[PDB]
Amino acid sequence: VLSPADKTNVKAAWGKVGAHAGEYGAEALERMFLSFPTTKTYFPHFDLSHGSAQVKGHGKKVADALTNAVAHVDDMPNALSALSDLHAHKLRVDPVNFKLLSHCLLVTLAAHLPAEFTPAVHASLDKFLASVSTVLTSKYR
Amino acid sequence: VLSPADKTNVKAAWGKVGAHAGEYGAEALERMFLSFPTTKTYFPHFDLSHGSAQVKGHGKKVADALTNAVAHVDDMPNALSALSDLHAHKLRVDPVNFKLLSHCLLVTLAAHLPAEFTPAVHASLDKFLASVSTVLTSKYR
Amino acid sequence: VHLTPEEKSAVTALWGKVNVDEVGGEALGRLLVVYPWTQRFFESFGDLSTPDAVMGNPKVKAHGKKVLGAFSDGLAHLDNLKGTFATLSELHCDKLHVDPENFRLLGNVLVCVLAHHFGKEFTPPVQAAYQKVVAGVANALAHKYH
Amino acid sequence: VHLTPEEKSAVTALWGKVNVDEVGGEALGRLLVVYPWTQRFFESFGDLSTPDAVMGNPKVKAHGKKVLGAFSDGLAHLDNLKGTFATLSELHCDKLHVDPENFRLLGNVLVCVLAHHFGKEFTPPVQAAYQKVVAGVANALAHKYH
Numbered sequence: 001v002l003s004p005a006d007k008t009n010v011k012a013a014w015g016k017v018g019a020h021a022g023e024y025g026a027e028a029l030e031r032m033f034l035s036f037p038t039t040k041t042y043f044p045h046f047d048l049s050h051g052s053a054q055v056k057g058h059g060k061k062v063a064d065a066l067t068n069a070v071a072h073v074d075d076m077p078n079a080l081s082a083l084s085d086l087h088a089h090k091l092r093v094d095p096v097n098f099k100l101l102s103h104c105l106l107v108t109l110a111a112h113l114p115a116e117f118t119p120a121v122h123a124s125l126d127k128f129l130a131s132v133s134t135v136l137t138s139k140y141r
Numbered sequence: 142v143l144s145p146a147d148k149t150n151v152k153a154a155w156g157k158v159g160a161h162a163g164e165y166g167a168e169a170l171e172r173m174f175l176s177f178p179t180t181k182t183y184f185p186h187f188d189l190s191h192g193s194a195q196v197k198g199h200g201k202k203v204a205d206a207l208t209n210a211v212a213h214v215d216d217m218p219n220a221l222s223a224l225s226d227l228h229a230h231k232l233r234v235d236p237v238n239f240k241l242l243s244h245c246l247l248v249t250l251a252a253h254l255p256a257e258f259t260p261a262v263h264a265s266l267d268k269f270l271a272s273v274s275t276v277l278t279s280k281y282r
Numbered sequence: 283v284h285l286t287p288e289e290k291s292a293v294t295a296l297w298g299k300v301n302v303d304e305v306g307g308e309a310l311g312r313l314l315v316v317y318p319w320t321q322r323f324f325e326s327f328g329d330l331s332t333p334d335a336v337m338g339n340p341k342v343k344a345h346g347k348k349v350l351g352a353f354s355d356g357l358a359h360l361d362n363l364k365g366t367f368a369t370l371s372e373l374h375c376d377k378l379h380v381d382p383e384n385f386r387l388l389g390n391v392l393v394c395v396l397a398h399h400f401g402k403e404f405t406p407p408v409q410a411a412y413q414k415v416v417a418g419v420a421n422a423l424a425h426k427y428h
Numbered sequence: 429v430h431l432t433p434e435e436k437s438a439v440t441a442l443w444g445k446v447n448v449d450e451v452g453g454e455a456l457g458r459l460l461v462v463y464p465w466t467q468r469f470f471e472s473f474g475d476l477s478t479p480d481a482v483m484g485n486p487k488v489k490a491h492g493k494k495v496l497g498a499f500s501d502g503l504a505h506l507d508n509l510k511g512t513f514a515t516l517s518e519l520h521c522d523k524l525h526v527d528p529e530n531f532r533l534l535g536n537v538l539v540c541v542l543a544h545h546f547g548k549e550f551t552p553p554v555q556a557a558y559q560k561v562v563a564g565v566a567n568a569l570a571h572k573y574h
């Protein structure tokens with residue numbers, strides 16, 4: 001559950017991603033696939049090579065989905081219902097993988113947004129990604 | 142995140158619990174303390190012996206809290222705000238312990254209400270207790 | 283895993299009443315229903331689309347019997363679980379890449395099934411003994427991760 | 429932990445640039461802020477009431493130095509993390525009963541702090557190598573649980 005301060009922090013920090021959405025999302029995926037190779041099993045027919053245009057395109061989708069989540073942060077299950085059906089119902093992604101990607105998103109934001117990534121904002125971003133993860137791993141239709 | 146059917150299952154199951162709510166809460170606590178002795182560190186001054194009136198009194202508090210949560214299943218953060226502050230802010234309970242108590246509550250329900258404890262109801266109750274746990278381990282003031 | 287003589291006696295007494303043709307399938311089935319991502323590992327098992335479909339699935343029942351057999355074997359080798367489960371650990375970790383939290387979940391679903399079946403016999407001290415056992419089995423299965 | 433010579437070289441090179449006096453405190457501090465229940469283990473450390481108080485707390489900074497030192501000891505002997513951390517494992521597991529998920533959390537907080545400090549230099553391959561290290565350290569710390 002996010003505090004009012006958490007929502008403020010996330011909106012501010014994620015708001016700085018902007019046109020770097022695809023870039024940051026792609027970097028987070030690449031970090032996940034490299035650091036935690038079991039996660040590649042969910043993408044059996046992807047080009048997961050370094051600099052892959054397919055991962056860059058997928059990075060933009062993930063980042064845009066996080067933008068969607070921020071714009072609906074008080075009502076996320078209804079805003080992400082399509083993504084929940086995909087990840088929980090269709091793909092059956094083990095919840096541990098969301099912790100791995102969330103960590104890699106934090107690493108990416110830490111590496112690109114040093115002024116923004118204070119301990120407080122770090123905490124709020126972690127909670128936000130955990131909330132998003134809970135929604136995407138739940139079946140609630 | 143609970144489905145509409147999850148909420149119905151939880152209300153129906155906890156309803157069957159009825160007047161035994163307190164007895165079951167005490168039993169779940171006893172199960173937790175015995176099965177997972179590290180949890181006793183949160184109750185250092187408690188009489189934790191079998192039959193403890195103090196444990197019995199605390200079990201009724203836990204059960205009444207769950208009854209309240211069931212009654213406000215659509216609005217649990219607001220309904221449990223005081224309890225969240227107690228467990229997450231004051232007591233600083235490690236989230237693993239909520240998984241342990243939740244399990245012991247399921248074991249208690251299974252032992253007492255085997256006909257009611259169908260696989261679908263088991264699933265809904267597990268999700269409900271996880272949702273309660275997420276609220277009680279969150280600081281959102 | 284060390285059990286007191288009292289714990290060993292109580293564990294053995296309860297296990298003797300377990301229906302070895304059914305309980306493993308009930309535990310596995312409830313795992314697939316309660317924690318639905320675990321179904322990804324059993325795509326070949328056919329219909330898992332509803333709780334009724336899962337629990338009545340012949341392949342779930344048959345495989346559950348093997349799982350229960352592993353738990354039964356473990357009960358006889360509590361001092362050497364890492365040895366006993368070495369082959370299974372290599373399968374579940376190195377080949378299948380099952381996240382080890384799921385081993386903990388299955389063990390606790392088994393405990394819930396024992397509670398369901400035996401009610402007042404599944405006392406808090408009996409549960410505590412079984413928690414030691416299923417933690418030992420989960421740890422041994424996860425050994426390749428340690 | 430199995431690091432290639434290339435991975436070990438990358439890890440060692442970066443660690444040579446890590447501030448011995450500050451980075452451990454930054455990691456421990458962020459652990460306490462991001463995962464507040466961990467504060468329960470540090471009652472005697474004084475003021476942990478706000479993020480600023482935590483990060484400015486002299487005892488957090490001082491204890492952080494010891495934590496970083498242990499990671500450093502791990503890097504010095506990657507082939508014997510279990511032996512290096514045996515005493516610390518007894519402490520954290522048998523004495524303090526820290527749930528071992530928190531070991532993983534602190535390792536990943538450290539990784540975040542390295543990324544924060546080094547920016548673009550903390551490439552995905554450098555991270556992957558560090559993830560092997562912090563997973564090894566967490567496993568070694570948790571050895572008494574296994």
Ligand code: HEM
Nearest residue numbers: 039042043061062065066083087091093097098101132133
């Ligand atoms: C914050 C967490 C996540 C977000 C916001 C997210 C978002 C998305 C989005 C927007 C899509 C595309 C949806 C569409 O095409 O309609 C997608 C697809 C997908 N996601 Fe994620 N995802 C997350 C976590 C994960 C994780 C942890 C995994 C597995 C390790 C995963 C596996 C997949 C797969 C396999 C696809 C489909 C790829 C394909 O075959 O086209 N997701 N996700």
Ligand code: HEM
Nearest residue numbers: 180183184202203206207224227228232234238239242273
């Ligand atoms: C379903 C999850 C839980 C529920 C519904 C719950 C509910 C409650 C309630 C109603 C109280 C009494 C508050 C008051 O009247 O002042 C309480 C107190 C407390 N809870 Fe829980 N709780 C849960 C999980 C846990 C867990 C997992 C732990 C630790 C293992 C824990 C540790 C405590 C402690 C230490 C107290 C205060 C006891 C005292 O010193 O008086 N709680 N809880």
Ligand code: HEM
Nearest residue numbers: 320323324348349352353378380384385386388389420423
């Ligand atoms: C925690 C206790 C567990 C025990 C005692 C256990 C035991 C077993 C046994 C005896 C087998 C058969 C091995 C063989 O045929 O050579 C097996 C296979 C398998 N297990 Fe488990 N298991 C456990 C947990 C899990 C979990 C949590 C999963 C998650 C999905 C899992 C996934 C599988 C799969 C996919 C197979 C192969 C099925 C096939 O033949 O297609 N296991 N397990």
Ligand code: HEM
Nearest residue numbers: 466469470494495498499524526530531532534535566569
């Ligand atoms: C995962 C990597 C970790 C490392 C490398 C590490 C390292 C250390 C070291 C070197 C000490 C000092 C030992 C001594 O003075 O004899 C220590 C003490 C301690 N650690 Fe950690 N630790 C880790 C994780 C954790 C976590 C996650 C927690 C709690 C959430 C924790 C709680 C403590 C406490 C309470 C002490 C004693 C503090 C005191 O003296 O009052 N440790 N640790």
